[PDB]
């Protein structure tokens, strides 16, 4: 199966900056600002550019211990960034891999919007337990938040 599940949200931070922050350097910023969500992130293969394979670790207690995503494409000018969950966590049996795409658009008022796909490649045709679609939304929710705050409190950061 291949069920998409888009999403959206707004932020004050201009796309430009938020992109650099939340995406580009985000994977080392997260254990800093959102300690209860992400324990630590490490580059299993690659130096962090396109193709890089990351092992994201979770604080003892949460549902999963780790998860490996894979940077797939990174458009710098348009702030589009794709990647794929491929091992550990939601992955297994029912789920094969989750492709994701995050695009950041600069609204006229200066702020911005984050669109977010989530094709869940399922085995044959089992279903997407609303469970996941739920967490994936909150997981990424808090994170965007934790960064918005930080970004705000440290105005000289990320440009």
């Amino acid at each position: 199966g291949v069920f998409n599940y888009e999403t959206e949200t707004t932020s004050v931070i201009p796309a430009a900056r938020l992109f650099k922050a939340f995406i580009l350097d985000g994977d080392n910023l997260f254990p800093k600002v959102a300690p209860q969500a992400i324990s630590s992130v490490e580059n299993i293969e690659g130096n962090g550019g396109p193709g890089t394979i990351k092992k994201i670790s979770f604080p003892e207690g949460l549902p999963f211990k780790y998860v490996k995503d894979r940077v797939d494409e990174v458009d710098h000018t348009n702030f589009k960034y794709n990647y794929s969950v491929i091992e550990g966590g939601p992955i297994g049996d029912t789920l094969e891999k989750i492709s994701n795409e995050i695009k950041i658009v600069a609204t006229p008022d200066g702020g911005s919007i984050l669109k977010i796909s989530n094709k869940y490649h399922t085995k044959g045709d089992h279903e997407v337990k609303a469970e996941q679609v739920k967490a994936s939304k909150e997981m990424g929710e808090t994170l965007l938040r934790a960064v918005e705050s930080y970004l705000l409190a440290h105005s000289d950061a990320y440009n």
Partner: antibody
Amino acid sequence: QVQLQQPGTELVRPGASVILSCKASGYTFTSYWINWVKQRPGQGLEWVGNIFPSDSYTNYNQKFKDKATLTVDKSSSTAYMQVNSPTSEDSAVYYCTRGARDTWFAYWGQGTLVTVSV
Amino acid sequence: NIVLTQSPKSMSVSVGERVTLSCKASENVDTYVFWFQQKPDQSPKLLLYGPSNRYTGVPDRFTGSGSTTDFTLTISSVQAEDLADYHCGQSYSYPYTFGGGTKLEIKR
């Protein structure tokens, strides 16, 4: 151990299909990318393209877009780079590589020398 | 499609000497740069993975630095072994590209 095994030589008649095999070992094949780089006698290196086994996702350098074709066989855990309609411009050595913790190209296959000739 | 430019095309120094190679990219690549050391009749070897970072093995005679657009590999005191063709690569954007290489030649 963690090795990329590949034939030392390949001779092919111009315009014949050339298959480059690269067999992994020592690591979980489907957990790592395979980057193919080609190099002609006393020349700079050239990124050919990459391919993540498991879901066989791939990226090709433009220059080879339609010449080359990467693929893999999860069962025998080995990857193949296929060249179509070879020519002297193609005679060169081809390395399949695997990166590691914080880089690419940490491990290199022996390199295969393709010679396109009658 | 980025372009890594290496200069000079070659260098000649005496064993014990100090040398520094340069790699300049057509854009910012941040830190997605790395160096290879290819001796005669050998597949390239990962020298500096990421600027200023010696990969497993590589002796402390090797070091490097940079970010943004200009990078450099430097050998404090060249040996007779260090005779090789030194390379550059970036994985900032796809396609990954390489420097043309800069051959290190010993004088005696």
